[PDB]
Ligand binder design. Structure first.
Ligand code: NAG
Ligand code: NAG
Ligand code: NAG
Ligand code: NAG
Ligand code: NAG
Ligand code: NAG
Ligand code: NAG
Ligand code: NAG
Ligand code: NAG
Ligand code: NAG
Ligand code: NAG
Lengths: 434, 142, 199, 50
């Protein structure tokens, strides 16, 4: 409902907490050059020796990918090298952080929401276990992991354990709740939490008296938002599609690489054993060469897709690092970067091969239309407000701030004089008491 | 070749694996099922300082507990000065396999050579290879 | 006829135009308020005064010189329209993307005439002249070549898709920051002191 | 007899198409409320007809 003399000013507000999930790293893998192609065969290894440095390049690329995965994790989570511990007190002016602060009861010092997130990913760490005792004498055939292990494909463990990542996140949380943004620019400087919230309110353009007068309501809204986030996490399971997608893609790539070993590639048989069993060597070289070419093309395809996926994950990790540095270590004025609305704060939470951000924002709730004028005329002078807008309650004229309806009587401190009343368009007549 | 618990069909002779590999074979004379395992173990990493520094190395065996390290790597039919790295004295067990050839210390330093699962190796003083838990940083409080 | 097809986009151009029209109406009738929540009405001159305060110039400068600024804006829009209607090389990027994709597809089609070391590139006159166990060698050579061509095409497509994804992410950030608000980043929403943007 | 060579190509092309649609949606679907152009054009001398 657009008009040239009508404005709408919000009266209430809502404190909303949103979730953002960003993949940070993927699984690191290694491939045996000889045991995948010519597994346990001196003749085939001798033939493979005539292909030069084909697989050294593959090993180099995979090593670079693993190194960059560790680097991505370090850049995302190691912003601060000082490990602040959670204070013994919880007097944060009515704010309840028990759902995100670490819980010493668990064997891994993780919070409730972190436990939910780590239990929401159905991966079971298939690369782990299988400690060369599981692939031993048993009635059943080999699993999908023993097949990879016996054909030269391995998974390297990450440098940082989940407990160390949890410690980093806990230090970040303690710093951001006990010092504000000061711990990112240097030494951590203590400040009561309500004062920090007032500073953020001033940052978003709302005077801190709004926070001070309505502290209890804001604290209750924050607690309810955290509870709703926890309930949503504990109910649904499709919010973590990205991390599960990365894990599934990597596992599918490895499984396809294993299952490609049964292709004939134009030879008499895909089994290397029953070529040297039936064919004399100089006749067997042709079949062995065809098999070598096919199995060497498979590895190149796998490595190329791995490099592309690594580039995508590196971009995601860079975005996550920027988000941490800007939303968590400070207050961001970029729109739609740290949550929809006016950004207040963010809280980091660790996830399997990823990070989770709890953005806290300020949203106006109920608007009310009013009549507004660009300027107020007086005895040969025009008046404009220093900070705020002019609003009339049908009979009187007041000045009020932008994002919260708080009318004030027009005095000399509110408005400044510039020019005369004829130049300005829409300037209305009203009295300005001193 | 080892003894197998797998059951073959009465007329079967070979057993095939997922990746078109021979798993178990029935002995023609004594009708018993023997499973076939490659004698090449994948997952051996060599931790070394530069060749200009020294020649000492520490070997890491992935996803193996050091009780069955000599069995896994077939240390019986191996040359000397490799059987030293199979059954040693500086035996340390980590979550990323277990490391042989490095002395374990309880002092936490900054990471120099990342091994995995929070364990890093470094070459320090005479000189020897030490392995330790990496340090995230200096403890602090507000 | 050789198995290569083009899939239509999910969103038609009319739906995209509707989205852009909604964005324009919101940004001209409410300011930046419609991005952070409910759209709140405000006269346009007051919104321009708010932007002037954002760039560091007191709003009385806008109020006193409203007509001149409006005329300058109209003249700038007219000059932009004339420049668009005169030249044609300003849209090199979109035409470049279209040409690259079309050239890739055309090259993939034209690669079907390569012999790849066989007697003939035509599959029909190999099974016509050679008995099957002898024809298997030629068929295998042709299969290997035509399977390598597809892999090269797919790898190039993946790299181009990554580049386009980066460009789309930049476009989304530009929309959110320049259109849904006022940006203080230098040289991000135009050279100078940013006031507004229109998609 | 060449295994799953082309299933991977189909998977990659499908992912590319899906990400193209996702790119368009992320760029253009920021707001889900379709505001219509006002009947008035009294924008204080500014001309948006073009
Ligand atoms: C614009 O404001 C003038 C007064 O300055 C008023 O007469 C006119 O009706 C307004 N325009 C509309 C569309 O209401
Ligand atoms: C704002 O909303 C809350 C929650 O409904 C309510 O308790 C409070 O009275 C409202 N404030 C105003 C000024 O309407
Ligand atoms: C914080 O919430 C938990 C459960 O949500 C509750 O047990 C605890 O008492 C709350 N904190 C305070 C100070 O009431
Ligand atoms: C304020 O008034 C205008 C015009 O009289 C109307 O279109 C608009 O809906 C009103 N606002 C509310 C919140 O009712
Ligand atoms: C607008 O608010 C003022 C402030 O109390 C009041 O005196 C005045 O009567 C109100 N106007 C109307 C029309 O209610
Ligand atoms: C305000 O002053 C102007 C000239 O200074 C005059 O035209 C107008 O009528 C006055 N308004 C009222 C309500 O007296
Ligand atoms: C084959 O002959 C050997 C030697 O006499 C004997 O030990 C073995 O039991 C025989 N196996 C069968 C299946 O007859
Ligand atoms: C190894 O490199 C260092 C580094 O300069 C050098 O001082 C040393 O002489 C080198 N060792 C040999 C044996 O050349
Ligand atoms: C195998 O490794 C585990 C480590 O989880 C260890 O507890 C166990 O004792 C090892 N096996 C033997 C036979 O010692
Ligand atoms: C290091 O800690 C282990 C485990 O407590 C202990 O057995 C060992 O003696 C310690 N080393 C030294 C030098 O004290
Ligand atoms: C806006 O421009 C068009 C052509 O550029 C013109 O026809 C129209 O009259 C202009 N608007 C006004 C209000 O004059």
């Amino acid at each position: 409902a657009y008009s040239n003399n009508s404005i709408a000013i919000p009266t209430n507000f809502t404190i909303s907490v949103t979730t953002e999930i960003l993949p940070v790293s993927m699984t690191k893998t290694s491939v045996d050059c000889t045991m995948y192609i010519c597994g346990d065969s001196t003749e085939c290894s001798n033939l493979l020796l005539q292909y030069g440095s084909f697989c050294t390049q593959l090993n180099r690329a995979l090593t670079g990918i693993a190194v960059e995965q560790d680097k991505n994790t370090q850049e995302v989570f190691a912003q601060v090298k000082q490990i602040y511990k959670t204070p013994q007190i919880k007097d944060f002016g009515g704010f309840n952080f028990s759902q995100i602060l670490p819980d010493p009861s668990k064997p891994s010092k993780r919070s409730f929401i972190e436990d939910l997130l780590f239990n929401k990913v159905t991966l079971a760490d298939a690369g782990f276990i299988k400690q060369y005792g599981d692939c031993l004498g048993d009635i059943a055939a080999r699993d999908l992991i023993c097949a990879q292990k016996f054909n030269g494909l391995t998974v390297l463990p990450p440098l940082l354990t989940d407990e160390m990542i949890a410690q980093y996140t806990s230090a970040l949380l303690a710093g951001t709740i006990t010092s504000g943004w000061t711990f990112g620019a240097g030494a951590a400087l203590q400040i009561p939490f309500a004062m920090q919230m007032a500073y953020r309110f001033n940052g978003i353009g709302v005077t801190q008296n709004v926070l001070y007068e309505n502290q209890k309501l804001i604290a209750n809204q924050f607690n309810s938002a955290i509870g709703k986030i926890q309930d949503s996490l504990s109910s649904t399971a499709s919010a973590l599609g990205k991390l599960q997608d990365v894990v599934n893609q990597n596992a599918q790539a490895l499984n396809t690489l294993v299952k490609q070993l049964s292709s004939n590639f134009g030879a008499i048989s895909s089994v290397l054993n029953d070529i040297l069993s039936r064919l004399d060597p100089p006749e067997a070289e042709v079949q062995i060469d065809r098999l070598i070419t096919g199995r060497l093309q498979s590895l190149q395809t796998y490595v190329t897709q791995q490099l592309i996926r690594a580039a995508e994950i590196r971009a995601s990790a860079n975005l996550a690092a920027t988000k941490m540095s800007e939303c968590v270590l400070g207050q961001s004025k970029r729109v739609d970067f740290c949550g929809k609305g006016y950004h207040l704060m963010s809280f980091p939470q660790s996830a399997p091969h990823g990070v989770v951000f709890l953005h806290v924002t300020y949203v106006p709730a109920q608007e009310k239309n009013f009549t507004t004028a660009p300027a107020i005329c007086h005895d040969g002078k025009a008046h404009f407000p220093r900070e705020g807008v002019f609003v009339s309650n049908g009979t009187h004229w007041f000045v009020t701030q932008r994002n919260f309806y708080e009318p004030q009587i027009i005095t000399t401190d509110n408005t400044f004089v510039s020019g005369n009343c004829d130049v300005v368009i829409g300037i209305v007549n009203n009295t300005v008491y001193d | 070749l080892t003894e197998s618990n797998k059951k073959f069909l009465p007329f079967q002779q070979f057993g095939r694996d997922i990746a078109d590999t021979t798993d178990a074979v029935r002995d023609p004379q004594t009708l018993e099922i023997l499973d076939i395992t490659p004698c090449s173990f994948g997952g051996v990493s060599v931790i070394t300082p530069g060749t200009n520094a020294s020649n000492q190395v520490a070997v890491l065996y992935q996803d193996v507990n050091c009780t069955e390290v000599p069995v896994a790597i077939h240390a019986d039919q191996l040359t000397p000065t490799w059987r030293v790295y199979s059954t040693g004295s500086n035996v340390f067990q980590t979550r990323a396999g277990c490391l042989i050839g490095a002395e374990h210390v309880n002092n936490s330093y900054e990471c120099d050579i990342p091994i995995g699962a929070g364990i890093c190796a470094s070459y320090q003083t005479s000189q020897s290879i030490i392995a330790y838990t990496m340090s995230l940083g200096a403890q602090n409080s507000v």
